[PDB]
Design a protein around this ligand. Structure first.
Ligand SMILES: Nc1ncnc2c1ncn2[C@@H]1O[C@H](COP(=O)(O)OP(=O)(O)O)[C@@H](O)[C@H]1O
Ligand code: VO4
Ligand SMILES: [Mg+2]
Length: 691
């Protein structure tokens, strides 16, 4: 039952839009929204909602794909589905992350180009699940034709890293507290040859700090599950998380997580990856030592002195150092006086902070060590020629309390959104001019340069923070003052905080919303200083793992006569964006449907907010107004000559002699441009004549 003008979409105050002209019933649950006759905000919203209602969580929208978290297991990821999707062109199968992986694989061998699968989304949208599903597809496909084979190690690298780098947050039960770029290397002929992982900025603060509604890293609770009681024995620890201050400040148990089963999965991954018992037990020992380290009490003799060595002893053993030397490093750290040393004094406040810093440094360096070890086994020294990189960053997040870590996370999300903007809206139209195509530049209003420049550019939030660290008499309020004196009333995206709920220092108009930031401790977080007397002990440690985590350590440079976290983050992020530009990108935009992890429920305003700040509608219009398929006149002649037997003057006669809408294609300098769908008709016609 449908009428052309009686069925119309009308705006709403509670559900965004309620049942602009509606699309005919033939376009219900359409696999590509660039084929809809009417393209408007509720037409896209309702098609996604209609497909989502039938557990169709993927939908193409122009050249990229959208995906809505089902919050339930669906039978769409089986090896039957994997093997079936192999070879299938995008239009010859329903929308899926498997179809993106296979088509990126096809472009890689066809164009002899490296590919990238860039997966966007808010915290909990589904980036990590979709990333693991890309890796799954490639490994399952390569497998067709103790420590396991390359394909199994590739698969098991993610549960092993998730134990130490994932944690429960208010928005996600398995939140990635670090970004990763996985490169899957292929030979000249297309065989899977090798893989590597590059991790970016692990949330160190989480090791020793938790907000009310969140857990520390999964690993702590997995060990405390007691499913491996030999671990509790080895680590000299109890089975109660509330006995360790570093790990029990917020939540301790997650309903969706069986910590006991996960401990087995984690251990099994280290096994398949080729980790020795000395390696595994060493990592467990350090995790255990970090728990003990947090329980070390101190007191005044201002000067701190140990208040009971019981926990200090347990940590010193798992680490392999003298307990008394560890306590004297913490309390009286050495100061270099040429070839001699003088102890500095530390009050209880200072020793406590120093202990926390060393615990976060050990944990972070253990994660970086583990990644290196995974890479060393994934390095097969087999012939490689190309790669398909997959980017799984920490998603856009807004907590009841936003600190430096959230700015680093949300900044990366802004950067990745700008990458989408530049590629889809700037580079695409620039190609229409390059190929001599008739094209009026369309301003789609997709440019976050204002917010990006506010954070990364000189005299921006991060540049201000970087200089301020290099001042010994600089306080949190001098940093806030410099931030305000430079940006309030000058930077449109920098505003006064819009505040019972934790006090905020400033506001930031991010692409996905206004985030209230609190600048307390940003100066100390960016500097990241360590008690080098203890790190020196770490270098001499009798536990090979602890000695190697700190062997590369470069201390505070020697003084002469007469590097920050944010600086390294921008440096990494810029190196990432410049390298991604040399690849063919495939965008997968993940949409979190509702706040309460409810399977099948779709919050129309939350969905519409995402589709808007992502630029889904804008990205659909450019595909509809332009010519998404482009073929070189030589390659076109090679393949479609069969339809009706100079490369351009041949393609001109051939296309005019065929029975097609002659307005659906335009001629470029070196390529013939086709509109949406027309390429499929020519391939269908070639299939009719090849039989
Ligand atoms: N495609 C999917 N199918 C089923 N459940 C999913 C899917 N994507 C995400 N989920 C659910 O959402 C949770 C968080 O998704 P995740 O991929 O970790 O999000 P992100 O990486 O964007 O933070 C998962 O633990 C799972 O319960
Ligand atoms: O929850 V996330 O993995 O998006 O950080
Ligand atoms: Mg994730």
């Amino acid at each position: 039952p449908f009428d052309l003008k009686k069925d119309v979409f009308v705006p709403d105050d509670k559900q965004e839009f309620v049942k602009m002209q509606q699309n005919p019933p033939k376009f219900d649950k359409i696999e590509d929204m660039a084929m809809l006759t009417f393209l408007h905000e509720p037409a896209v919203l309702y098609n996604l909602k209609d497909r989502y209602g039938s557990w169709m969580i993927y939908t193409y929208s122009g050249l990229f794909c959208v995906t809505v978290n089902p919050y339930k297991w669906l039978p769409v990821y089986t090896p039957e589905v994997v093997a079936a999707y192999r070879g299938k062109k995008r239009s010859e199968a329903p929308p899926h992350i498997f179809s993106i992986s296979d088509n990126a694989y096809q472009y890689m061998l066809t164009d002899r180009e490296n590919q990238s699968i860039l997966i966007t989304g808010e915290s909990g949208a589904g980036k990590t699940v979709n990333t693991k599903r890309v890796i799954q597809y490639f490994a399952v496909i390569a497998a067709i034709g103790g420590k396991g084979t390359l394909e199994d190690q590739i698969i098991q690298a993610n549960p092993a890293l998730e134990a130490f780098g994932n944690a429960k947050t208010v928005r996600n039960d398995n939140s990635s507290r670090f970004g990763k770029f996985i490169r899957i290397h292929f030979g000249a002929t297309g065989k899977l040859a090798s893989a590597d992982i590059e991790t970016y900025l692990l949330e160190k603060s989480r090791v020793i700090f938790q907000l009310k509604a969140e857990r520390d890293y999964h690993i702590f609770y997995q060990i405390l599950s007691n499913k491996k009681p030999e671990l509790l024995d080895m680590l000299l620890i109890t089975n109660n998380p509330y006995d360790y201050a570093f790990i029990s400040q917020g939540e301790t148990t997650v309903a969706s997580i069986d910590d006991a089963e996960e401990l087995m999965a984690t251990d099994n991954a280290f096994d398949v990856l080729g980790f020795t018992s000395e390696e595994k037990n060493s990592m467990y020992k350090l995790t255990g030592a970090i728990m003990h380290f947090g329980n070390m009490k101190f007191k005044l003799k201002e000067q701190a002195e140990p208040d009971g060595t019981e926990e200090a002893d347990k940590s010193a053993y798992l680490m392999g150092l003298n307990s008394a030397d560890l306590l004297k490093g913490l309390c009286h750290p050495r100061v270099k006086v040429g070839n001699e040393y003088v102890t500095k004094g530390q009050n209880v406040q200072q020793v406590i902070y120093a202990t926390g810093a060393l615990a976060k440094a050990v944990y972070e360096r253990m994660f970086n060590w583990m990644v290196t070890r995974i890479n060393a086994t994934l390095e097969t020294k087999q012939p490689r020629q190309y790669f398909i990189g997959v980017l799984d960053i920490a998603g856009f997040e807004i907590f009841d309390f936003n600190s430096f870590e959230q700015l680093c996370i949300n900044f990366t999300n802004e950067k990745l959104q700008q990458f989408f903007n530049h590629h889809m809206f700037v580079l695409d139209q620039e190609e229409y001019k390059k190929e001599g195509i008739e094209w009026t530049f369309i301003d789609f209003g997709m440019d976050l340069q204002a917010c990006i420049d506010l954070i990364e550019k000189p005299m921006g939030i991060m540049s201000i923070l970087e200089e301020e660290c290099m001042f010994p008499k600089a306080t949190d309020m001098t940093f806030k003052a410099k931030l305000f004196d430079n940006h309030l009333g000058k930077s449109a995206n920098f505003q006064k905080p819009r505040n019972g709920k934790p006090e905020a220092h400033f506001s930031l108009i991010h692409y996905a919303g206004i985030v209230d930031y609190n600048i307390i401790g940003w100066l100390q977080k960016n500097k990241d200083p360590l008690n080098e007397t203890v790190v020196g002990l770490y270098q001499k440690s009798s536990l090979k793992l602890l000695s190697t985590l700190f062997a590369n350590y470069a201390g505070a440079d020697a003084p002469i006569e007469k590097q920050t976290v944010s600086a390294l983050h921008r440096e990494n992020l810029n190196k990432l964006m410049t390298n991604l530009r040399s690849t063919h990108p495939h965008f997968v935009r993940c949409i979190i449907p509702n706040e309460t992890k409810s399977p099948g429920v779709m919050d129309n305003p939350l969905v519409m907010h995402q589709l808007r700040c992502n630029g889904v509608l804008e990205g659909i219009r450019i595909c509809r107004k332009g010519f998404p398929n482009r073929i070189l006149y030589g390659d076109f002649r090679q393949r479609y000559r069969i339809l009706n037997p100079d490369s351009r003057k041949g393609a001109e006669k051939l296309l005019s002699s065929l029975d097609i809408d002659h307005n659906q294609y335009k001629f470029g300098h070196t390529k013939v441009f086709f509109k949406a769908g027309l390429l499929g008709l020519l391939e269908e016609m070639r299939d009719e004549r090849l039989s």
